[PDB]
Structure formats: structure tokens, C-alpha cells
């Protein structure tokens, strides 16, 4: 495949988020570190096995890709309500 | 007054809390730092003016005293 | 100290007074003071919450970043 | 580095492999080490800790890569 799969991605379904709290990975190999107010792209809401998980894989401003607890972030809403 | 007022206190009313997330004060003079997991004793839920607030005054493990957002902590429940 | 990149050179204003506890590496600041940020890194290279600054009086030293505010255009 | 207090002397095991940042120490899942200090070259609370490898190597490592034993 490609970095983001094989089929086309609809840019309208791409979600963004802002970290609500600082976060230090308990697992430095699977997770990413966050500072309150960081923005990121939500790449997937499934674990490595393909299961629905409360840990979401994201891509931070740094370019780092790892998981973060869903309740530690805020999905930016449409138009302006961030 | 004493450190905690003048009227006797009811023990089964004192609440303790556990930090849910790390917290860095935006106001170092009014707030206390925190690390996820930290224990504390809740002194009061009133702001410095006596009003209700989302900022509670706590006594940390260290002995520090300051305010922390209420949604950043978890009040420990019973037996 | 170290020659600063003209990109990351920022000036800060102190929001609260800071009384050094360890004047060895800590600098004194009074609410409202102006200072240049020398580095956002710790003694041993690594992003820390203690920034190295330069006082208006030329004093170098570390300070907690939440005591200051970057003066933005 | 310097004399440690018999109260704060702890041993840790490496939870995940760690690759040096030559100014710090290298780790491999499973390795043992003694935690000399949970501070920095300044003395303030830090995420990085100073340790001594089983091979006598000293240097800093991210505290979330290790686990204090017992």
C-alpha cells in the first residue's frame, strides 16, 4: 500500500484535535507525547490488530505518529467551535 | 481562626483526591503543580472571595497548598 | 551565552515576581521585567520547563517558563 | 557520580529498548540499573533520570522507559 492505505481519501472526513492535557507516554514505542493545546491529525481509531480502540493513532505537528487516549484530546468541530 | 477555621470539623466530611492528569500552573502563585496519580487533601471548593468555583484548594503530598481545576482530579470514594 | 538564531530570539516579560531559591543558576525577576530568552533547554540539552534568560541587567540564569510571557508582536 | 543516600537508592529494569540521545545511556529491554538521581544537572525535578548501567555506564534516561523494581 501507500502511507495512508490504497484507496482515495475524502479530505472532508479528515479529523483534527487539540490536546486537553499534557501527556507522557507509558509506552514510548506505541504512544506520542502531548502538551496541552497541541494540534494533531487523527489517523485512525482502531488498534494495531484492527479493533475499535479508545486509543487513537494520531500524527502530531512534529510529524510523530503514535496513539493517545481519546479522552485526552478534543476533536475540533466544524467551521469554528474548535 | 485556626488554620481551618474556628468551629470543630467533622472528619467524615474531609475528602481526598487523586490527580487524573499532569498539571502545570498558569499562575504559580495561586496554583500547585501536579503529576497524574498524586494524592491530595481537599481543603476548600470556594474561590478566594468565598464564591463557588471550578478551582479547588488542595494540600498536596509535598505540603504545598494551592488551587487546581476540579476536572483534573478524582475524589476518592469509600471502603 | 550561546549565539542565538535570529529566528528563535524572543523577549519575555515577567508576570509574577520570582525569588531565586538557588541563586546559583536561578535569576531574580520582578513582575513586569523585560528579558531575552537564551534557551528553552536544560543544563544537559533537553526540552525543560526552566528557561535560560538574560535580565535587563545582564544577569543570565534559569526561570520557570510559567512566570513569564513571550512578548509577541 | 556522587554519594547516594541509602534511602533513595533504587534499582530499575528497562521496559523498552533505548538508544542514546553519547551524552546519556543506552538501554535494552530487560537490563538492570541503579537510579542515582531523579533530577537533572541543576537539581530540579525531571523526566530524565541519572543511572548506572550493569556495565558501569552512567548517564540520563527517560523515566518512562524503566520501572523501579520491587
From Swiss-Prot, chain A:
Function, as annotated: Component of the PEX13-PEX14 docking complex, a translocon channel that specifically mediates the import of peroxisomal cargo proteins bound to PEX5 or PEX21 receptors. The PEX13-PEX14 docking complex forms a large import pore which can be opened to a diameter of about 9 nm. Mechanistically, PEX5 (or PEX21) receptor along with cargo proteins associates with the PEX14 subunit of the PEX13-PEX14 docking complex in the cytosol, leading to the insertion of the receptor into the organelle membrane with the concomitant translocation of the cargo into the peroxisome matrix.
Metal-binding in keyword set: no
Residues annotated as domain SH3: 12-78
The species this protein was found in: Saccharomyces cerevisiae (strain ATCC 204508 / S288c)
Disulfide pairings: none
Subunit structure: Interacts (via SH3 domain) with PEX14 (via SH3-binding motif); forming the PEX13-PEX14 docking complex.
Protein name: Peroxisomal membrane protein PEX13
Localization (cell): Peroxisome membrane
GO cellular component, one term: peroxisomal membrane
Coiled-coil segments on the chain, per record: none
One annotated GO molecular function: protein transmembrane transporter activity
Topological region Cytoplasmic: 5-82
Keywords from the named record: Membrane, Peroxisome, Protein transport, SH3 domain, Translocation, Transmembrane, Transmembrane helix, Transport
Protein's gene: PEX13
An individual GO BP term: protein import into peroxisome matrix, docking
Family named by the database record: Belongs to the peroxin-13 family.
Swiss-Prot record, chain C:
Topology feature Cytoplasmic, residues: 1-73
Places the protein is found: Peroxisome membrane
Domain SH3: 7-73
The organism's place on the tree of life at top rank: Eukaryota
Family: Belongs to the peroxin-13 family.
The protein's assembly and partners: Interacts (via SH3 domain) with PEX14 (via SH3-binding motif); forming the PEX13-PEX14 docking complex.
Other noteworthy facts: Present with 7900 molecules/cell in log phase SD medium.
Protein name, entry field: Peroxisomal membrane protein PEX13
Amino acid at each position: 500500500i501507500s502511507e495512508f492505505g490504497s484507496e482515495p481519501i475524502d479530505p472532508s472526513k479528515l479529523e483534527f484535535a487539540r490536546a486537553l492535557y499534557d501527556f507522557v507516554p507509558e509506552n514510548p514505542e506505541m504512544e506520542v507525547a502531548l502538551k496541552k493545546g497541541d494540534l494533531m491529525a487523527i489517523l485512525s481509531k482502531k488498534d494495531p490488530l484492527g479493533r475499535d480502540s479508545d486509543w487513537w493513532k494520531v500524527r502530531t505537528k512534529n510529524g510523530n505518529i503514535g496513539y493517545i487516549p481519546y479522552n485526552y484530546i478534543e476533536i475540533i468541530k466544524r467551521r469554528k467551535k474548535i
